[PDB]
Amino acid sequence: PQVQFKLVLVGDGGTGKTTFVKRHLTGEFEKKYVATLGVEVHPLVFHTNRGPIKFNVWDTAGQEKFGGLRDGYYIQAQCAIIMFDVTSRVTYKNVPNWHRDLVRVCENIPIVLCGNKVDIKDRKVKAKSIVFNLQYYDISAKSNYNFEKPFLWLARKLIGDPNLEFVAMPALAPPEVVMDPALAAQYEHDLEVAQTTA
Amino acid sequence: QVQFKLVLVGDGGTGKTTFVKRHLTGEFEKKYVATLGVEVHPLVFHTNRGPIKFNVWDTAGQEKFGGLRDGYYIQAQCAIIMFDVTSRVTYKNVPNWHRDLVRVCENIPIVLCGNKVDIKDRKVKAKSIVNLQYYDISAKSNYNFEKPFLWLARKLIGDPNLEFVAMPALAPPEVVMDPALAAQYEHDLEVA
Amino acid sequence: QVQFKLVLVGDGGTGKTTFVKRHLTGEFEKKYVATLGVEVHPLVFHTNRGPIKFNVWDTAGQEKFGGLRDGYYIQAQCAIIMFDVTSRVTYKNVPNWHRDLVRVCENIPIVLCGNKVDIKDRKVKAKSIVFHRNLQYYDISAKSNYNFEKPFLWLARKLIGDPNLEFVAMPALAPPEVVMDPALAAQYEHDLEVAQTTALPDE
Amino acid sequence: KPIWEQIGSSFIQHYYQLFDNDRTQLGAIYIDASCLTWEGQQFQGKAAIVEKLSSLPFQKIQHSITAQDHQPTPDSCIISMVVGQLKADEDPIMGFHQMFLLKNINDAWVCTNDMFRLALHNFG
Amino acid sequence: KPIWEQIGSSFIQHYYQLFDNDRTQLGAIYIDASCLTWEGQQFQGKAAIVEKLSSLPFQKIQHSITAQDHQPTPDSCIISMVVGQLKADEDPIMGFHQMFLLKNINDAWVCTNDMFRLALHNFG
Ligand SMILES: Nc1nc2c(ncn2[C@@H]2O[C@H](COP(=O)(O)OP(=O)(O)O)[C@@H](O)[C@H]2O)c(=O)[nH]1
Numbered sequence: 001p002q003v004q005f006k007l008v009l010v011g012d013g014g015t016g017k018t019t020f021v022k023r024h025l026t027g028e029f030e031k032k033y034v035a036t037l038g039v040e041v042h043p044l045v046f047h048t049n050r051g052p053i054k055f056n057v058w059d060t061a062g063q064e065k066f067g068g069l070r071d072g073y074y075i076q077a078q079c080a081i082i083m084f085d086v087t088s089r090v091t092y093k094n095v096p097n098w099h100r101d102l103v104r105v106c107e108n109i110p111i112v113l114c115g116n117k118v119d120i121k122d123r124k125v126k127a128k129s130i131v132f133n134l135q136y137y138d139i140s141a142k143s144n145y146n147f148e149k150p151f152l153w154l155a156r157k158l159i160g161d162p163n164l165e166f167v168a169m170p171a172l173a174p175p176e177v178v179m180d181p182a183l184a185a186q187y188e189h190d191l192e193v194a195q196t197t198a
Numbered sequence: 199q200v201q202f203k204l205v206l207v208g209d210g211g212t213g214k215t216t217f218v219k220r221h222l223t224g225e226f227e228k229k230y231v232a233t234l235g236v237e238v239h240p241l242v243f244h245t246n247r248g249p250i251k252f253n254v255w256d257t258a259g260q261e262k263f264g265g266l267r268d269g270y271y272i273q274a275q276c277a278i279i280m281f282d283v284t285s286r287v288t289y290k291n292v293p294n295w296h297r298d299l300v301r302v303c304e305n306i307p308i309v310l311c312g313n314k315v316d317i318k319d320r321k322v323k324a325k326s327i328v329n330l331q332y333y334d335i336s337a338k339s340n341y342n343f344e345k346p347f348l349w350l351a352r353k354l355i356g357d358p359n360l361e362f363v364a365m366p367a368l369a370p371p372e373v374v375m376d377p378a379l380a381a382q383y384e385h386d387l388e389v390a
Numbered sequence: 391q392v393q394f395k396l397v398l399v400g401d402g403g404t405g406k407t408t409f410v411k412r413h414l415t416g417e418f419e420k421k422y423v424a425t426l427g428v429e430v431h432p433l434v435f436h437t438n439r440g441p442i443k444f445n446v447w448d449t450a451g452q453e454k455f456g457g458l459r460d461g462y463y464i465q466a467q468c469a470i471i472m473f474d475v476t477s478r479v480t481y482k483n484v485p486n487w488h489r490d491l492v493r494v495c496e497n498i499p500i501v502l503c504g505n506k507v508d509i510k511d512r513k514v515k516a517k518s519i520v521f522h523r524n525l526q527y528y529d530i531s532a533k534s535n536y537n538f539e540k541p542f543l544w545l546a547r548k549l550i551g552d553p554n555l556e557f558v559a560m561p562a563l564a565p566p567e568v569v570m571d572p573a574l575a576a577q578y579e580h581d582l583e584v585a586q587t588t589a590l591p592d593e
Numbered sequence: 594k595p596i597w598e599q600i601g602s603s604f605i606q607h608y609y610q611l612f613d614n615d616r617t618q619l620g621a622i623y624i625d626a627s628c629l630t631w632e633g634q635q636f637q638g639k640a641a642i643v644e645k646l647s648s649l650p651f652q653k654i655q656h657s658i659t660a661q662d663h664q665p666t667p668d669s670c671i672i673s674m675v676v677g678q679l680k681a682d683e684d685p686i687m688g689f690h691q692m693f694l695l696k697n698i699n700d701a702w703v704c705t706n707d708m709f710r711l712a713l714h715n716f717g
Numbered sequence: 718k719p720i721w722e723q724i725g726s727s728f729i730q731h732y733y734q735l736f737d738n739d740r741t742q743l744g745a746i747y748i749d750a751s752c753l754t755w756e757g758q759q760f761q762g763k764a765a766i767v768e769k770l771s772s773l774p775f776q777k778i779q780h781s782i783t784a785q786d787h788q789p790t791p792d793s794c795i796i797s798m799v800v801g802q803l804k805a806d807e808d809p810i811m812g813f814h815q816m817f818l819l820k821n822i823n824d825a826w827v828c829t830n831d832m833f834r835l836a837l838h839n840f841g
């Protein structure tokens with residue numbers, strides 16, 4: 001029928017996975033909870049210059065706070081977002097564990113790494129540490145900062161068009177926090193420098 | 199709108215699901231709730247007092263393993279207890295179902311239904327059967343389909359003169375109900 | 391004397407004759423009875439409570455063409471059922487030997503023996519061997535005299551009613567024609583131990 | 594792999610293979626002291642248990658294990674707990690939970706205690 | 718109601734009361750010989766168990782019991798199985814199971830064995 005892509009969203013509890021996916025208002029409105037699987041599936045539609053794409057984002061019911069995910073949570077995933085908290089160094093050090101599982105259960109699908117809560121001034125995990133088929137982005141879910149970036153990169157990879165663009169932002173929940181334009185510019189530069197080093 | 203939660207209970211294989219599925223818009227508009235093990239069939243009836251809706255709870259077959267959960271019974275305003283007229287054991291389990299129901303819901307109206315009366319070799323007859331009403335039904339033939347719902351509606355609304363001004367669209371009969379048997383069955387029960 | 395008839399049975403080629411022949415004096419003193427198709431070996435074992443004599447009945451190969459006659463089984467006070475651990479068919483016939491044995495001799499003590507455990511590429515392993523459940527099992531290798539005394543000791547303990555009975559000395563045995571790898575032997579004994587301790591009930 | 598986990602895993606595989614194949618033969622894993630609680634209903638001993646399981650009114654059933662955990666107890670028993678799914682006849686797939694306690698009696702691990710519940714609840 | 722049902726129900730009520738309000742105070746029910754398997758991860762001893770349960774990354778949690786079944790064991794223990802639902806923080810409601818083996822020591826019942834799982838599966 002439609003070109004749908006299963007996107008599994010994973011990462012340590014409290015990293016802001018749920019807050020992040022909920023930003024897309026229609027996807028929240030039209031989500032579906034399946035308790036047997038422990039997942040809320042959000043249909044996130046984005047509109048590219050070459051038409052619409054639909055990400056079916058699997059958000060956990062918080063069972064990562066209890067233990068590991070069932071393998072069937074990952075099954076048939078076509079892309080993924082690994083999420084950590086830039087104010088919590090442990091969430092970042094657990095990223096390889098998440099990556100480890102994804103590669104095991106899943107095919108060589110594209111994966112995006114997202115460091116969340118960059119609006120919080122006291123940042124522990126910075127660009128330098130992060131940069132040393134995978135990409136990284138700073139995001140702040142509470143301020144919609146860089147919200148579209150992970151989806152654009154995955155869309156480009158999945159469709160095989162590196163010149164793919166989004167012609168319009170989906171309806172987003174209004175920012176509950178200000179992303180300081182000065183910090184954002186600085187972080188964006190810190191990433192420019194870290195990229196030049198890579 | 200006026201809606202009533204109706205729990206449809208009884209032994210496995212008595213024809214509960216076949217009965218409720220008869221109501222076509224109710225089947226089409228049903229909703230499965232996995233955690234509760236129920237399919238809720240929203241059955242609308244047009245009455246001389248306006249539209250009423252019986253939200254009928256049908257099991258996912260878990261009555262085969264044992265009793266139903268409280269959450270299945272909770273806030274039911276009426277109930278249908280069903281059994282198989284060809285299986286006497288399903289009828290001897292009626293009090294257990296009644297008991298399980300009352301334990302959660304003390305004083306709701308109940309209709310008892312002996313299903314499969316189209317099967318000529320019948321084991322449970324009017325002799326043995328006579329806020330609780332009984333009707334013969336045959337789900338496969340649409341026979342007496344409306345009877346339990348009309349009684350419950352009159353009882354619930356408190357209007358003994360409530361009428362269904364229209365019959366819901368029913369799945370076409372898959373079996374014929376013998377007119378002579380029906381008349382006899384109806385005669386037997388009328389008399390008391 | 392204190393003697394017992396012992397019937398040694400099982401499929402042909404399982405190594406029954408090789409086994410009984412290990413006891414050199416019993417081979418020397420054997421008596422052949424053509425009419426019953428048997429060679430009877432007087433196997434003397436010397437226990438701490440004195441000597442015991444197992445008169446072992448060995449076939450003349452008739453098991454290759456079908457079961458043994460009642461005249462063979464009759465009056466047996468104990469028995470050994472043998473199979474080949476490299477041949478699955480011989481282990482699948484073990485129940486058939488038990489049945490015939492029980493028909494003519496209902497309640498006698500029986501030992502089950504998996505022969506030729508010296509051969510690598512064993513097919514019938516410990517885990518598979520749960521049949522025995524008056525029954526006892528042992529690995530044996532006739533060609534190497536491995537565990538040769540085990541079945542007779544167990545049978546001697548049951549018959550006399552003394553579970554503490556020991557053999558004070560091994561009889562004169564034919565020198566091993568084959569090596570039983572000690573490491574391989576230790577492993578096999580461990581497998582059987584574990585199989586027993588992790589046993590679920592019988593069907 | 595610990596010995597208790599070995600015995601437990603074997604028991605679980607055998608119990609569900611047999612249940613799905615033929616309920617009526619499950620008597621062999623119990624004894625007369627055995628306790629069953631089946632969806633709240635209690636049964637004692639080999640016979641009553643076999644009667645109960647055999648009487649379950651479905652023509653066919655299938656089980657699958659999602660997770661099984663095993664432990665030894667101070668009294669040298671084995672606890673075996675299961676969370677899985679099942680399908681009776683053509684009904685929807687349902688989760689289930691089951692607990693077994695194993696004791697080594699007469700050189701075989703018999704089930705002394707058994708508890709079963711469907712994964713159905715009170716809140717939708 | 719049998720004695721094992723009265724004791725079992727009291728343990729259950731006390732366990733989840735403590736668990737829902739202050740996990741850190743759950744040591745008292747466990748001993749050094751206690752075994753906990755928590756979503757597959759095994760733990761031994763009162764100290765290690767309390768640490769694990771305290772470290773669980775949620776701020777609030779709430780359990781409701783769907784069903785609890787209690788039996789007496791041949792070695793005079795009480796084995797209990799629980800099926801129910803929980804809610805951590807503001808997350809969705811999930812099903813769960815939990816088993817307890819209670820042993821009477823010095824006229825005081827303590828948990829020697831504990832197993833926990835979320836009622837989650839690989840496929841619907
Ligand atoms: N300041 C800030 N807090 C956030 C952000 N995203 C999530 N949080 C907070 O992190 C906590 C847990 O978020 P949640 O979405 O439940 O994380 P999850 O466990 O990965 O689903 C909540 O109290 C949120 O307010 C963000 O972008 N900025």
Ligand SMILES: Nc1nc2c(ncn2[C@@H]2O[C@H](COP(=O)(O)OP(=O)(O)O)[C@@H](O)[C@H]2O)c(=O)[nH]1
Pocket residue numbers: 208209210211212213214215216217259313314315316317335336337338339373
């Ligand atoms: N002859 C006859 N069979 C029926 C009738 N209603 C149901 N059945 C049959 O009874 C069997 C079980 O019916 P089902 O609806 O699944 O019973 P349930 O377990 O109570 O839901 C099916 O094979 C149906 O075909 C009826 O009115 N007449």
Ligand SMILES: Nc1nc2c(ncn2[C@@H]2O[C@H](COP(=O)(O)OP(=O)(O)O)[C@@H](O)[C@H]2O)c(=O)[nH]1
Pocket residue numbers: 400401402403404405406407408409451505506507508509530531532533534568
């Ligand atoms: N490798 C090995 N071969 C054996 C052993 N016992 C018997 N055999 C061989 O098996 C064949 C038949 O053995 P035999 O004693 O005649 O078996 P029987 O028919 O049961 O008496 C002979 O070729 C033997 O060499 C053993 O312990 N190890």
Ligand SMILES: [Mg+2]
Pocket residue numbers: 017018019059060061062
């Ligand atoms: Mg979440």
Ligand SMILES: [Mg+2]
Pocket residue numbers: 214215257258259
């Ligand atoms: Mg049904």
Ligand SMILES: [Mg+2]
Pocket residue numbers: 406407408449450451
């Ligand atoms: Mg021979």
